[model samples]
Target: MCDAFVGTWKLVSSENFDDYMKEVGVGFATRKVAGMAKPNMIISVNGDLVTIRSESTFKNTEISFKLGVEFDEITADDRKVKSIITLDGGALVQVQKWDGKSTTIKRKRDGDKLVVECVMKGVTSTRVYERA
Candidate 1:
């Protein structure tokens, strides 16, 4: 079951990611760069603890958390954020706090595709990942 959560995945494609960044109030230039980035996600899972690292030439971010436990996350740019993660059905559900508000992102597997969904700020964006 955890096998799907372990491995390196690359961002081969995305949809509406720029719009999602706009919804988050990111600047045009930053969004442009981010949209062009082929972000890579490296995941290491040990029992209930999971460490996920996302990296690109422009930015890098990492988070380590145990299922059903809350943790602190520091962005690559050094921003502080709070997050909690748990398993919902077969999906990993994450609730992240920033600017005093909480946003949700879910990671799940659908057949051969890994799905990530960001649900917040009146917009929802989904990114699909393929094994690298």
Candidate 2:
């Protein structure tokens, strides 16, 4: 299960991400650029600690946290971030604090697929990744 999440995964596609950002109170101009940007995620996990780096042409953000532990996270783009992770069954559940609200994401496996569910922005966006 952990092997599925390692390495670099490029954003090949997204769905309803605009609405997701909107719910986060991202401005119209920022959303427009973010909607069109393809961000790649590089994740390195060791035991319960995970370092995730999100890279894009417009901005880059990196977060480090331990599973089932709460920590403060700040995006490289200077967005104030905080998050906590808890294990749900075998899945890793993350609750992120941003802009005075919290958003949750569930990381789990669906068959051979690595699925991340974004829940907060009225619209749920699933980011599917393939092994690189």
Candidate 3:
């Protein structure tokens, strides 16, 4: 299901991502760092298992799991979360929860671009990516 997404994707654009950080309760310094950081997203798959990795100077995050399976994740902002990811049609939908708060991240591809929508507490940030 995720074969097309198995590539190195780099950041192209991000919209309203600062508000997303605030909604998620990140610190002020972290927000500034996040605003200036552009991470590369790498997706890999093996049999039924999948791994999504984020690489950047500020922080790195990696998650390996199968569809519908939940696992512990330390977010880029260092939030300890429980995360689950599933595929819906051509898009991958991921939900993360921690401290009674939840966030949803949706990744969908469009030609040579990958668009990610991050949603938390009614705030949505759209991030665009390109194959690298």
Candidate 4:
């Protein structure tokens, strides 16, 4: 099912992440801190509840939810949002809304890698990860 994403993965590459953060309304200091972070994303599934945890020296963020269920999320940059995640094919498609703004983040396994695409306000960022 969602087993392809049930592993610990480390960030290997990122493109246009700063611009994406800027469009998400992250402040300069937080953006700088977040920009330098190379987080390890740990994803696990326990029955209908799935968990995605991002770990880094700078900060850590975690979320656990069932597919299609909306939950409150406090982002790594500390934005409070209403988020819902669902599976589109084998990919995890997530949408977060806050303060009348919305963003979509999709994570899928490509070959032996995990690719995360974040889009907001016409800005898109790609973050690639490898199994750890």
Candidate 5:
């Protein structure tokens, strides 16, 4: 068994990002600039620790949490979430449980493209990334 997600990934394209911004009710400053920025992420899991770091022109975010552990996450989208990440089969499933709502972000490699599907409020949008 291997965690195939240990590397740097860069954004290729993002769909429905504006809708996500509106639903999350991000601040004016963040929402305004989010469209101008592209997201690149670095995930490290070389040891017992794990880190997810996202970089962009608008803002940078870094979060660390162990597998099977619950933690607090405040996204750039202005969500106060109790989130957890788990490995399901070969895909990685990260769930954000908000007050009474929930969002699921599932990521897996599709050949050379890093495919990310986000389901929130029942509609699903996709994000694709390529290896950097």
Candidate 6:
């Protein structure tokens, strides 16, 4: 699901990230902690294989997956999942299934900005990033 997207991204803006986490089933205090955090993502792509290093002071997470292939994923909040990612048009689309629930994320570059949209149980959130 990745190709020319090999680069580092810095957090610039976010919308309803707390709601996204809530849908992920995180607790209140942790959501507050997450709300206050600004994180970075380092994305690397080699053909269809992709790796994302999620960097932050509170916690760091990494995800590696092949395009359109289902794989095990441990989410940032430590949720174990079966996930797949795909590149649709110019967006990286991700689907994660955990405990019979689903989460979807889309990452795309808007001009020089990287826009990420997340949806879990119908609640949608958006996060924006910039090249670092």
Candidate 6 stretches greater than 4 Å from native: none
Q: Candidate 1: list runs displaced more than 4 Å.
A: 76-78
lDDT of 3 by residue, 1-132 (tens): 598899999999999999998999989999998889999999999999999999988788889999999989888888899999989988999999998989999999998999999999899999999999
TM-score of each: 0.88, 0.82, 0.97, 0.98, 0.87, 0.94
RMSD of 4: 0.7
Give all candidates' CA lDDT scores. 0.79, 0.74, 0.93, 0.94, 0.80, 0.87
Error of 6 at 88 (Å): 0.9
Q: How many pairs of residues collide in each model?
A: 0, 0, 0, 0, 0, 0
Clash-forming residue pairs, model 4 = none
Q: Candidate 1 on 1-132: residue-level lDDT in tens?
A: 366778888876687877777776668888888788888888898776788999898798878788888788875434477888888888989887878776688989888777888776868888888889
Pairs of residues at least 3 apart in sequence or in different chains that clash in candidate 3: none
Superposed by TM-score, candidate 3 places the C-alpha of residue 112 at a distance from the truth, in angstroms, of 1.2
* Candidate 3, residue 36: how far the Cα is off, in Å: 0.5
TM-score winner:
4
What is the C-alpha local distance difference test score of candidate 3? 0.93
The TM-score of candidate 5 is: 0.87
Which window of 10 residues has the lowest lDDT sum in candidate 5? Answer: 20-29
Taking all chains together, the TM-score of candidate 6 against the true structure is: 0.94
Model 4, position 77, has a per-residue lDDT of: 85
Where is model 5 more than 4 Å wrong at Cα? 27-29
**At residue 85, what lDDT does model 6 achieve?**
88
